[PDB]
Design a protein around this ligand. Structure first.
Ligand SMILES: *[C@@H]1O[C@H](CO)[C@@H](O[C@@H]2O[C@H](CO)[C@@H](O[C@@H]3O[C@H](CO[C@H]4O[C@H](CO[C@H]5O[C@H](CO)[C@@H](O)[C@H](O)[C@@H]5O[C@H]5O[C@H](CO)[C@@H](O)[C@H](O)[C@@H]5O)[C@@H](O)[C@H](O[C@H]5O[C@H](CO)[C@@H](O)[C@H](O)[C@@H]5O)[C@@H]4O)[C@@H](O)[C@H](O[C@H]4O[C@H](CO)[C@@H](O)[C@H](O)[C@@H]4O[C@H]4O[C@H](CO)[C@@H](O)[C@H](O)[C@@H]4O[C@H]4O[C@H](CO)[C@@H](O)[C@H](O)[C@@H]4O)[C@@H]3O)[C@H](O)[C@H]2NC(C)=O)[C@H](O)[C@H]1NC(C)=O
Ligand SMILES: *[C@@H]1O[C@H](CO)[C@@H](O[C@@H]2O[C@H](CO)[C@@H](O[C@@H]3O[C@H](CO[C@H]4O[C@H](CO[C@H]5O[C@H](CO)[C@@H](O)[C@H](O)[C@@H]5O[C@H]5O[C@H](CO)[C@@H](O)[C@H](O)[C@@H]5O)[C@@H](O)[C@H](O[C@H]5O[C@H](CO)[C@@H](O)[C@H](O)[C@@H]5O)[C@@H]4O)[C@@H](O)[C@H](O[C@H]4O[C@H](CO)[C@@H](O)[C@H](O)[C@@H]4O[C@H]4O[C@H](CO)[C@@H](O)[C@H](O)[C@@H]4O[C@H]4O[C@H](CO)[C@@H](O)[C@H](O)[C@@H]4O)[C@@H]3O)[C@H](O)[C@H]2NC(C)=O)[C@H](O)[C@H]1NC(C)=O
Ligand SMILES: *[C@@H]1O[C@H](CO)[C@@H](O[C@@H]2O[C@H](CO)[C@@H](O[C@@H]3O[C@H](CO[C@H]4O[C@H](CO)[C@@H](O)[C@H](O[C@H]5O[C@H](CO)[C@@H](O)[C@H](O)[C@@H]5O)[C@@H]4O)[C@@H](O)[C@H](O[C@H]4O[C@H](CO)[C@@H](O)[C@H](O)[C@@H]4O)[C@@H]3O)[C@H](O)[C@H]2NC(C)=O)[C@H](O)[C@H]1NC(C)=O
Ligand SMILES: *[C@@H]1O[C@H](CO)[C@@H](O[C@@H]2O[C@H](CO)[C@@H](O[C@@H]3O[C@H](CO[C@H]4O[C@H](CO)[C@@H](O)[C@H](O[C@H]5O[C@H](CO)[C@@H](O)[C@H](O)[C@@H]5O)[C@@H]4O)[C@@H](O)[C@H](O[C@H]4O[C@H](CO)[C@@H](O)[C@H](O)[C@@H]4O)[C@@H]3O)[C@H](O)[C@H]2NC(C)=O)[C@H](O)[C@H]1NC(C)=O
Ligand SMILES: OC[C@H]1O[C@H](OC[C@H]2O[C@H](O[C@]3(CO)O[C@H](CO)[C@@H](O)[C@@H]3O)[C@H](O)[C@@H](O)[C@@H]2O)[C@H](O)[C@@H](O)[C@H]1O
Ligand SMILES: OC[C@H]1O[C@H](OC[C@H]2O[C@H](O[C@]3(CO)O[C@H](CO)[C@@H](O)[C@@H]3O)[C@H](O)[C@@H](O)[C@@H]2O)[C@H](O)[C@@H](O)[C@H]1O
Ligand SMILES: *[C@@H]1O[C@H](CO)[C@@H](O)[C@H](O)[C@H]1NC(C)=O
Ligand SMILES: *[C@@H]1O[C@H](CO)[C@@H](O)[C@H](O)[C@H]1NC(C)=O
Ligand SMILES: *[C@@H]1O[C@H](CO)[C@@H](O)[C@H](O)[C@H]1NC(C)=O
Ligand SMILES: *[C@@H]1O[C@H](CO)[C@@H](O)[C@H](O)[C@H]1NC(C)=O
Ligand SMILES: *[C@@H]1O[C@H](CO)[C@@H](O)[C@H](O)[C@H]1NC(C)=O
Ligand SMILES: *[C@@H]1O[C@H](CO)[C@@H](O)[C@H](O)[C@H]1NC(C)=O
Ligand SMILES: *[C@@H]1O[C@H](CO)[C@@H](O)[C@H](O)[C@H]1NC(C)=O
Ligand SMILES: *[C@@H]1O[C@H](CO)[C@@H](O)[C@H](O)[C@H]1NC(C)=O
Ligand SMILES: *[C@@H]1O[C@H](CO)[C@@H](O)[C@H](O)[C@H]1NC(C)=O
Ligand SMILES: *[C@@H]1O[C@H](CO)[C@@H](O)[C@H](O)[C@H]1NC(C)=O
Ligand SMILES: *[C@@H]1O[C@H](CO)[C@@H](O)[C@H](O)[C@H]1NC(C)=O
Ligand SMILES: *[C@@H]1O[C@H](CO)[C@@H](O)[C@H](O)[C@H]1NC(C)=O
Ligand SMILES: *[C@@H]1O[C@H](CO)[C@@H](O)[C@H](O)[C@H]1NC(C)=O
Ligand SMILES: *[C@@H]1O[C@H](CO)[C@@H](O)[C@H](O)[C@H]1NC(C)=O
Lengths: 624, 624
């Protein structure tokens, strides 16, 4: 095994465990110290204002198993510190018959058992588990634990009658899944249900959704309500909140609803951020965010979606969330988005970016798998004075339209997402910032034009505003992680409305994924404008490429170029002419970003281990 | 619920949990503080000379589940003290994927991991488990833990390759069971295998048997040898040590070998006790003790057996233990005998006495189930100068015969069992002892003759020597726990060779078992004697009746009389006449015995709990 990145890569499968630990590794984002990670979990803002983030974790392995909560904290979403206890950076792990198969995703009751922060999580035990298997009741249950030391440790309730697990009965038969409890307070839902509380007797101030579905009949998000305020054992099933059809799709802008939901959450937003009104704020919109399974041919059969919903009260004292419009939270290799409230009327969302090594060819050589996305403020994006001639505007696919009284303009409403400002400020302030001159892309434009200042490593951010003619057929964008032989091309093609990431040349290492990523982006044309603009922000962080368009569209993906000099970046142009010109302005390079884990050394591998021959006997975990 | 024991019992099923805690409870023997117990485990003499005893334990329940090691210690086998740690009196419990279904029976390596006492135990996980089910590999494995604090706590080896579990591969397919590892040193087996160690490479000084069998083809005791001295991970399967047939019986004196072995151990004894020679002691005999399943119509389908064996070395470097003769360790409601070495060349054996409430009618009202037997010294019983006219002597069923050179006398050899002298001394010394006058049972003998001194409670011992004519048809014995309306009759009938416990009147409470217990007892007639003698010792301890005959035959059973005055005792006589007389001598009553748990209050119940609806979902434990 040669690690010479000035020549072509050899057979890297001969390399030892964790020999490629630093080669492709993100430095500026949330990631476990080593080993396997997946979904964020247990997210909450602590009493001191800091952020506690948990994650599905399997240390010293590069496949899922014995799944536990790893945890860390930060005062600014950006610079983090690991917890360190008797189980290293783990704070919850399988330990009881009810959760021995895995401590799955869970969410936080901030004032829970004895007033302490409390996690409601999916406790798993033995048996077939999965949307495509024949799961039985008991395999997935929901259990409580609380912390008396701000997340350094958690104490589970005892096993038994009237204790853990607290939710175990399936609300309907033949479930495809029954997990990922999302606990939330909702003045909105309380106001809606207030006239029906005699029917159910459920009067608590916390609601919980559980994600699942029904075999052959589509996904379900099940709604429970805490039976009595201040008491956390009894949760009353109200009814299904969201019901979708077997592999139903709302269309090209909305992914596919699959067969089973996962990691679903419920929030309420207005243009500024989180909305905690009872329905009285006419600018507020109710949203559900959710993953779906088996409605996608690639990306691990997983769509991370969202929907705006209008709540209706059923006669039995339950809530139907009727989907008004439906979109995609991220179009790339990410999933398992969790959102949580943050002081100052914010709802912040974060997901998991998986690797692009689905055949597990170099995972051992990495010595880790997975990272988080960046943390994102959610809000209602409102675009005023939209031209009615915007192509496809009245499809109202992942947005709503409201006509002006005179019919000459439209107000567009959709889900907004933007990187939390703490991270943008820290990134910029710690980087070498190059403010670049604007560039007209015309007949003289090369296919690729390097920026006048270049990155120094694989940790940088780009921004640019691309102004297109209303009838353009030109394409433009950014090339990143680029040398002569390796590069990743991010294109927008306004004629097709497609944002693509072409990865056919991303790496000389052929075992990594190279499929083209694709997002739809609607450029809402403004009344009186003779052009349409794409604001593109790109974060390059080891192997992560995370793209944001117009504080709306997100696409996370992976690139693993071998060569040390595959770090360059610049502008892409295709079919730009004297007549079809793309004006690029607001161009800026931030080189370096932030060291997100300042206390960690460069190599935090502790080696990898094998569970031995019993892993196959038990059949629960791959074993490595 | 009335607890008036001066009148007939009401409907005791209306009584609350643990309301009958003290009513029938042993006071003079090893028993858990409360709840469910079964098999002894983890028995060893500690460095300070005290005895550590573990037991299969499920606190706050009255059926088996979450099975754990409860533990206590004693300097004299007789007066005990509970361990008290973070899990009460438990010291090992289910905690890992490999043992989450139960910490089953295990045995002690005295100089194990890092020189510390080390337990090798059956770690169980999910799946069908049982001799009559379709068990699969992995469900029962064998794991290690060690103690740095003389049994107050145990540290398990880690889960994984080269660590726990240490034995997981089934030595043959389609096993009925794979559990109860018995670790032992054996100069005998080492000497026998010394010429074959090149074949197997196994040269360690510890052996281990694992108890099981093969579906449709009888029981098996599998022999392993520690691969390398001072190393405890690698154990090499040599071959089957004991192989018996599907429900094979050696006859009337030997129970039935069933379909599966449990709790089997290997020892070597001579007339004084334990023998640690290499084969050079011609007075020493190799023994296996073992439980069998499904070869019995009652007594929970369980026979606690033993066999004298002659070892043969196989060509592949393994040992066949060929059964020479075969007997019964206890004929009553006991099982799961474990033996362990004790200083002064002793091997001490102890088992578990189950209740006689198999339909679980009053178990909750008890608030506990189970006790130990008394601790028993094992030795080779040798009877010299036996008359060749002893009926049935040359059947050599559970004994051996060696003729004198002249053929006029026989030496009989069998397994001897006697209560450890520490217990007999402590019992007698703490009791009110009444030495009773000898009694001739003749034509004037009543059916029942109370002793001249009477017990004061349900805690006493009796002894007597019953001298019978060689052609007697009379029966004699002891009645115990007796009032006019309730009593338990212990009869010996030399003509049939049957020792019986008749329990048709043991209790007014009709839900307890009332079947007649039966043991065979061979009165070896001595050359020149005109009579034959039965030495009977009986311990009455709450509901336990534990009978010893001639330091050979043991029979443990249960009686639960309701009335407070059902405590009396005396002599039984049937068919005694002027010509057929039974001479009873050496009669002694010990009233009171010892308070075996001096630190415990009278009621150590902590209440009972229910596991809730998930118990049935998981299907592993009854849940109460
Ligand atoms: C199979 O068997 C298994 C083993 O038995 C069994 O698992 C065990 O289950 C039991 C029962 O559920 C669990 O017991 C609970 O423990 C909770 C605390 O748990 C934390 O702490 C313990 C013990 O802590 C120590 O010991 C360890 C080990 O040495 C040390 O590491 C610690 O430093 C600490 O040591 C100190 O203390 C020791 C003595 O205990 C000393 O020896 C030592 O020197 C030190 O000084 C840990 O072991 C736990 O770890 C395990 O669990 C965590 C997850 O939780 C894992 O991550 C980890 O790996 C371990 O597996 C853990 O850290 C107790 O809080 C709980 O006690 C209460 O609940 C019951 C009701 O169920 C009440 O009876 C009791 O009164 C307590 O409730 C009161 O208090 C709470 C708040 O504290 C209130 O909310 C509540 O309302 C109530 O209040 C009442 O009283 C108040 C009085 O002030 C009053 O104010 C109120 O008004 C009110 O009236 C319970 O004891 C046990 O932890 C499990 N153990 C393990 C190893 O799993 C398993 O379930 C079985 N399975 C099946 C299928 O049956
Ligand atoms: C799913 O995830 C699960 C959770 O991660 C996982 O279970 C965990 O597995 C790991 C890995 O196997 C276990 O880790 C081992 O722990 C052993 C010790 O275990 C005992 O102690 C721990 C920790 O003790 C403390 O913390 C608790 C909780 O707060 C307190 O109660 C205690 O008081 C004590 O607290 C003090 O210390 C804390 C810091 O640790 C402080 O925070 C605190 O303030 C106090 O000061 C307990 O948690 C354990 O309890 C659990 O397990 C018991 C059964 O064992 C249960 O009954 C109980 O309910 C709990 O479940 C337990 O009591 C370590 O000994 C072991 O360390 C060694 O092994 C590895 C190799 O595997 C080596 O890397 C390492 O060096 C150690 O080996 C050396 O040392 C030994 C002798 O000590 C030698 O034999 C050996 O050769 C080697 O020697 C070498 O170094 C020497 C240096 O001196 C040198 O001399 C030699 O020459 C040689 O070179 C290991 O860390 C962990 O316990 C499990 N935890 C739990 C909760 O289960 C599970 O497996 C996963 N499942 C799957 C399917 O993957
Ligand atoms: C005495 O000790 C027992 C432990 O043995 C303590 O707990 C009780 O255990 C028994 C089992 O021995 C349980 O009986 C079973 O009950 C279920 C149905 O339970 C439901 O109905 C109950 C009656 O109103 C109710 O109390 C239960 O509520 C508890 O449990 C729920 C979880 O479901 C929890 O949320 C609550 O907070 C309570 O803790 C519950 O709603 C029944 O299905 C079982 O039936 C089987 O067995 C019977 C008898 O063999 C048979 O007739 C059936 O056909 C079936 O096979 C079984 O009856 C009892 O529920 C437990 N009670 C509890 C936990 O409160 C008991 O508390 C101790 N008493 C005291 C005073 O300490
Ligand atoms: C690097 O990290 C790995 C963890 O990922 C460390 O452990 C090794 O993990 C791999 C899995 O990633 C294991 O590979 C499997 O091995 C088994 C067969 O194992 C046997 O043969 C080995 C080779 O001689 C031997 O080392 C093993 O000994 C260990 O385990 C036994 C318990 O069985 C234990 O008693 C010993 O003490 C050792 O700990 C063992 O005898 C094989 O069956 C598996 O095959 C599957 O997968 C492959 C590849 O996909 C495929 O070809 C097959 O068809 C099948 O699907 C698999 O290869 C490896 O055994 C682990 N090695 C160990 C534990 O030593 C590894 O140690 C780390 N290296 C370093 C230097 O730290
Ligand atoms: O069939 C068993 C299954 O086990 C493992 O997968 C478990 C579960 O993981 C994922 O679910 C989410 C979201 O991705 O991740 C956590 C668990 O870490 C859940 O709380 C959450 O819903 C998958 O999306 C599920 O499909 C999957 O069942 C293992 O990884 C699988 O390979 C498989 O063996
Ligand atoms: O089928 C599962 C089975 O689980 C429980 O029984 C387990 C096991 O217990 C007994 O085995 C012994 C000896 O009696 O006891 C310990 C376990 O505590 C073992 O180490 C030891 O061999 C029985 O003899 C076995 O037949 C039995 O499989 C439960 O009690 C059963 O009812 C049943 O549900
Ligand atoms: C980048 O590195 C490769 C291999 O060392 C080399 O061929 C190339 O010329 C280098 N410089 C570039 C692309 O600017
Ligand atoms: C790469 O090495 C592996 C062994 O790790 C080998 O099986 C494979 O054929 C090699 N690939 C080549 C030489 O292209
Ligand atoms: C309430 O009604 C809805 C609509 O039919 C149903 O799906 C849900 O299960 C009902 N809630 C119950 C039975 O608690
Ligand atoms: C919205 O405006 C467009 C263009 O003016 C028009 O076609 C459509 O009918 C309007 N919708 C409503 C509800 O007035
Ligand atoms: C650099 O990053 C840290 C960590 O997030 C942040 O607190 C600090 O303000 C940044 N430095 C600047 C903006 O100069
Ligand atoms: C030019 O773009 C406008 C929308 O901006 C569209 O309505 C019109 O049809 C386009 N012209 C073509 C296709 O010739
Ligand atoms: C744009 O994307 C859609 C997928 O939504 C695809 O069907 C279409 O072919 C794409 N067109 C171009 C020109 O990229
Ligand atoms: C024993 O008690 C019962 C019920 O109180 C009574 O009938 C009997 O006469 C008492 N005395 C005996 C049997 O000596
Ligand atoms: C005893 O009480 C139980 C209830 O615990 C009842 O079902 C049974 O019929 C009663 N037996 C009688 C009255 O003989
Ligand atoms: C040794 O031979 C015996 C007798 O055939 C056999 O039962 C046992 O499995 C053999 N040992 C092995 C294969 O290790
Ligand atoms: C043992 O003694 C009996 C009676 O003397 C006799 O019948 C039998 O043949 C003897 N056995 C041997 C081996 O001599
Ligand atoms: C009473 O019993 C204790 C506990 O076993 C024992 O140590 C003591 O010697 C006994 N008293 C005697 C023999 O007087
Ligand atoms: C009397 O007993 C002896 C053995 O002690 C026996 O050999 C003999 O047959 C018996 N007498 C009978 C049955 O008449
Ligand atoms: C003695 O016990 C045996 C069982 O071994 C039995 O078959 C026989 O009938 C019994 N005889 C008498 C008289 O009790």
């Amino acid at each position: 095994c040669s690690l010479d990145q000035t020549v072509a890569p050899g057979n890297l499968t001969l390399c030892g465990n964790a020999t490629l630990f630093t080669t492709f590794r993100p430095k500026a984002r949330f990631i476990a110290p080593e080993g396997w990670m997946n979904a964020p979990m247990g997210l909450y803002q602590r009493a001191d204002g800091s952020i506690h983030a948990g994650y599905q974790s399997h240390p010293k392995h590069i496949q899922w198993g014995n799944i536990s909560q790893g945890a860390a904290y930060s005062s600014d979403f950006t610079s983090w510190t690991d917890f360190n206890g008797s189980e290293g950076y783990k704070t919850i792990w399988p330990s009881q018959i009810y959760d021995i198969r895995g401590v799955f995703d869970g969410s936080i009751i901030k004032e829970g058992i004895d007033g302490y922060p409390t996690i409601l999580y999916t406790s798993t035990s033995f048996g077939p588990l999965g949307a495509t298997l024949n799961e039985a009741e008991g395999t997935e249950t929901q259990s409580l634990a609380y912390t008396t030391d701000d997340g350094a440790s958690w104490i589970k309730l005892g096993y038994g009658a009237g204790q853990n697990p607290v939710i175990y009965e399936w609300p309907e038969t033949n479930l495809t899944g029954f997990r990922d409890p999302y606990v939330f307070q909702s003045p909105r839902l309380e106001a809606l249900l207030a006239n029906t509380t005699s029917i159910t007797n459920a009067t608590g101030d916390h609601f919980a959704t559980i994600s699942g579905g029904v075999h052959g009949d589509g996904a379900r998000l099940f709604l429970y309500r805490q039976h009595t305020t201040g008491e956390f054992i009894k949760w009353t099933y109200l009814g299904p909140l969201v019901t979708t059809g077997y592999k139903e799709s709302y269309g090209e802008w909305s992914g596919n609803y699959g067969i089973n939901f996962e990691t679903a959450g419920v929030t309420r937003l207005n243009p500024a951020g989180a909305a905690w009104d009872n329905g009285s704020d006419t600018t507020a919109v109710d949203f559900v965010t959710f993953g779906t399974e088996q409605g996608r041919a690639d990306h691990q059969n997983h769509w991370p979606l969202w929907a705006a919903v209008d709540y209706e009260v059923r006669d039995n004292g339950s809530i139907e969330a009727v989907i008004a419009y439906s979109g995609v939270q991220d179009w790339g290799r990410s999933y398992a988005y969790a959102s949580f409230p943050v002081e100052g009327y914010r709802q912040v969302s974060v997901g998991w970016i998986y690797e692009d090594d689905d055949n597990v060819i170099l995972a051992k050589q990495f010595g880790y798998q997975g990272a988080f996305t960046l943390f994102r403020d959610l809000f209602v994006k409102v675009v005023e004075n939209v031209s009615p001639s915007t192509p496809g505007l009245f499809e109202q696919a992942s947005w709503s339209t409201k006509n002006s009284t005179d019919g000459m303009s439209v107000t567009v409403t959709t889900l907004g997402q933007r990187v939390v400002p703490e991270t943008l400020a820290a990134y910029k302030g710690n980087s070498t910032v190059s403010t670049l001159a604007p560039v007209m892309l015309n007949e003289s434009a090369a296919a690729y034009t390097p920026f006048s200042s270049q990155p120094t490593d694989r940790f940088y951010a780009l921004t640019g505003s691309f102004e297109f003619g209303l009838n353009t057929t030109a394409k433009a964008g950014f090339r990143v992680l680029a040398s002569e032989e390796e590069y990743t091309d991010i294109w927008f093609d306004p004629a097709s409305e497609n944002l693509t990431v072409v990865r056919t040349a991303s790496s000389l290492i052929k075992s990594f994924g190279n499929d083209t990523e694709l997002a739809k982006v609607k450029l809402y044309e403004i009344v009186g404008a003779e052009s349409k603009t794409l604001n593109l922000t790109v974060f390059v962080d080891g192997s992560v490429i995370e793209i944001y368009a117009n504080d709306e569209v997100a696409l996370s993906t992976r690139a693993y170029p071998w060569l040390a000099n595959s770090t360059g970046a610049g502008l892409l142009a295709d079919g730009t002419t004297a007549g079809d010109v793309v004006g690029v302005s607001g161009l800026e390079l931030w080189d370096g970003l932030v060291d997100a884990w300042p206390a960690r050394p460069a190599n935090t591998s502790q080696g990898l281990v094998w569970d031995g021959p019993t892993a196959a006997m038990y059949g629960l975990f791959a074993g490595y």
